[PDB]
Design a protein around this ligand. Structure first.
Ligand code: XBA
Length: 189
């Protein structure tokens, strides 16, 4: 309920560092990583996994989880560490595809100064998030919850909406506890 948390700094010699860095560096090799931190919020983690369980019973053969990037301002880090991507933080996200939290497949998307806004020290922030993309469709700005999969059973909704169903670039999650901010990357130009 209180959703307290811990910030563990990974040594660059830690395997975990090599993995997160490896993925980041697919599109952001010209940037300079200063630290990667793991975020441990047991309440949030339990909450996240609770949803993952009920989604893994519904979507049959679908791989519901993805690891996607999300940039934000220095001044949002404590709110996200504690609360995740709850409903108040979606008021500060684009509406082009709906009113939820936006997650990019590639780290260069998030590495934009609109999203990973450089701080007073010129340091930029991008989370490497676990997100339940599940079953998804094309999106639009007017949405506040995802569209109905079945018009004949419209209380069963899509999990997320994307820019492009067959070749996605970003994903929009609308529900609380549908993403876990596992890793935080800190870097400069
Ligand atoms: O990484 C992202 N972070 C974010 C959060 S921005 C953050 C900036 C400081 C503010 O206080 C909180 C909100 N939004 C995004 C949106 C995206 O798509 C928006 C266009 C398709 C319409 C793609 C992205 F990669 C991202």
């Amino acid at each position: 309920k209180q959703q307290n948390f811990c910030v563990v700094e990974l040594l660059p010699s830690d395997p975990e560092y090599n993995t997160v860095a490896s993925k980041f560096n697919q599109t952001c090799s010209h940037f300079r990583i200063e630290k990667i931190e793991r975020i441990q919020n047991p309440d949030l983690w339990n909450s996240y996994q609770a949803k993952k369980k009920t989604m893994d019973a519904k979507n049959g053969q679908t791989m519901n989880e993805k690891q996607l990037f999300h940039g934000t301002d220095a001044g949002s880090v404590p709110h996200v560490n504690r609360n995740g991507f709850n409903r108040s933080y979606a008021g500060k996200n684009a509406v082009a595809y709906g009113k939820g939290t936006y997650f990019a497949v590639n780290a260069n998307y998030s590495a934009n100064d609109t999203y990973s806004r450089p701080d007073a020290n010129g340091r930029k922030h991008v989370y490497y998030v676990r997100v339940l993309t599940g079953i998804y469709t094309h999106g639009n700005h007017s949405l506040i919850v995802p569209p109905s999969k079945n018009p004949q059973n419209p209380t069963d909704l899509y999990d997320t909406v994307t820019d492009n169903v067959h070749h996605p670039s970003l994903f929009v999650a609308f529900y609380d506890y549908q993403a876990y901010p596992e890793y935080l990357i800190t870097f400069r130009k």
